[PDB]
Symmetry: D3
Subunit: 135 residues, 6 copies
């Protein structure tokens, strides 16, 4: 349904809100999500220290947890809580996954520099010499 | 060495340059990288369609490729090409990995909505009803 | 049901058809799949550039996409399109996953040779010497 | 060096030899590898039941093992044993990884058929009806 | 439901039973599981050599297999067989995943020692010297 | 070298010490490790909140970090710190990886029970009925 467009709008809203860049009733949902987060996020991290996705997370785990959100009934408030929870999950996941990805590539580059390139750089006057030439 | 601080500066420069947000001689390197990219990136994607990292990429593959960059000697130009290559690798990797991550979480949420929540939403007047109440 | 035997037959048919080796109504399905592919695959890659599986693809993503294949109704033609889509997905996935796997092992071997073995090989007359002896 | 072309030739030789399809001194190496395998593979699986790669295998593990192959010296025979070992590793890895990949996609398809498609198929005369029409 | 508490109890029972440490009707289920395992596990490994999880196993594969356990009907015996199967799956998965994890970290440490530390250790009298000092 | 036997002994010592079960100078190293941990682990978690391995951690990251342990020289104390660090890394990694693995399998089982089995269980008197029969 348009449920996915709803989800996508909420997720990109929350992501851009926390300062992540990559380049209808949706409004009411954005605002209710904000309101919820402003009221309840201290009230949700003391037993909610889960935070993070692993690349091998199954949908069934997600389902079980959110199931305990809806165990004794669906109202609009817990739907909002659901969206907010998904958004927090998203923000955290991309945060840490981006840390590890960039860290991996940076580590690789540092390694290659230190093995194959630093000798030459030392026998040619170091980076100083560089900024002289291609400065 | 300070090689890693160099690498990190270049990577965050290139990432923020392509519009990715998450919240010395470094200058000469930034500029030489830019210059290189402005001169050679059409000249590098016709046999350079590799682009992407897999979560199971080994450093040895990276090493072999960059090795073919330095096969017959190290000069400053190919060092710059090395940094630029690493930056392109980074940008592409985070781009696509972020697409798949966010897509996964969004798919999960859409699924849960459509299985456990949409019935109730239909028996309570739909999202219209929602924007009436928590509007 | 026998749905899985159907699926498996179609997948191995399509894989062996594209030249991949590893060592009923099924016929009508093979032929309809072929026919479909002969009619529509230029008509499916301009907005269908997805191609590839990641080891961390969820069933929910697959479900959402194929859902947009069946959004306004099931007929036999879109069932055939479904099978063909699955087969294309399979072929592409194994193609690229095999590239990266073999590339990883090959890179490892090249590395080990170049670190631990090439010295000795150079102090014993090189591979020429080898083909003299164990030739 | 040309070490990688050596490795690649040996790997594709061994893979095509075991019947896997995807579409110099190399000869002496192919033959010595064959000879080795014909002499020693019963002599190598009783304490060599390792077989398989995981997507998260490090080069360091590979290095340690092959290190125990070369612990007290490099001769041509153990170089050949090295290539043969790498080839066996490759063949096994692609074998099992292909099993799990194809099995995953097939399982997905079976699932989707059984949830979204089989009802309709039952209300339209089943696959028999299909082979009548698009036969 | 309390189905998950059931599952969790059975899994931790079976894990602690095989000697894995990490720090109601449940009883009847534990005992029936034991009884089942004592009667049928030779009768289940000749065509049941699957054993292992990959980090990229989908729930759909699990579902298909267990589906063939329940193909022609649910009775209590096959429910017990289901729990026992899940427990075996668990034990095997953690066994092998723990082997590979610990092996990876150990390999890393061995590598670092042999590259950065062993020189110094040799120029300072070796580990003997160590047990003299911090003994 | 025997460096790996050293590493393995230390790792299994530390793991069994924290209560994990799976079924020379080594002593001086065990004791020095213990001593170190008793003196410094409050002094190491305020800027050392890293803890965890991802299945896609490269050796190069490990190398860079431990490199900052040895930046201005190798003495025996920092070798001990190295072993202790590796052991902590191991314990944490297996802890959390075991949590997620067992949680995944348990979630799968709960799901299957709730979809395919719970209906039948409700039409046959529930688990009470079970403990009557196979009690």
């Amino acid at each position: 349904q348009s449920n996915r467009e709803l989800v996508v709008d909420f997720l990109s809203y929350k992501l851009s809100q926390k300062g992540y860049s990559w380049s209808a009733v949706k409004q009411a949902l954005r605002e209710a999500g904000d309101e919820f987060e402003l009221r309840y996020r201290r009230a949700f991290s003391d037993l909610t220290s889960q935070l993070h996705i692993t690349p091998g997370t199954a949908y069934q785990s997600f389902e079980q947890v959110v199931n305990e959100l809806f165990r004794d009934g669906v109202n609009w408030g817990r739907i909002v809580a659901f969206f907010s929870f998904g958004g927090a999950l998203c923000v955290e996941s991309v945060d840490k996954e981006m840390q590890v990805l960039v860290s991996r590539i940076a580590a690789w580059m540092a390694t290659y520099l230190n093995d194959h390139l630093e000798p030459w750089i030392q026998e040619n006057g170091g980076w100083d010499t560089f900024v002289e030439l291609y400065g």
